[PDB]
Amino acid sequence: MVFQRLLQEQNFTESTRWLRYIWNPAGYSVQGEMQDYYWNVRPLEEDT
Amino acid sequence: LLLTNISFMSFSEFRHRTSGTLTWRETDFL
């Protein structure tokens, strides 16, 4: 919802951040190291 | 290798550089 609202108000550099909070195709940097996933939500990783 | 060279590489690069000799606490401190 926050990302959709920031897209409608065209704050692009924050909308892409709020999309990075759920999906990043470039992986995630956790404690300096990369991760093995791309979806930040575990019921989106495993289809619950 | 000096502190000028350490601040260029990323933390994963540095942790792969000194993985065996140090134990990540002194690596983080450096």
d(CA A34, CA B23): 19
CA distance B12 to chain A (A): 6
C-alpha dihedral (B5, B8, B12, B14), degrees to nearest 10? 10
Does B17 lie at the interface with A, CB-CB under 8 angstroms? no
Buried b (16+ CB within 10 A) or exposed e, A8-28: eeeeeeebeebeeeeebeeee
Q: What was the structure determination method?
A: cryo-EM
Deposited resolution, Å: 3.7
CB contact under 8 A, B15 and A34: no
Q: Does the beta-carbon distance from B11 to A32 stay under 8 Å?
A: yes
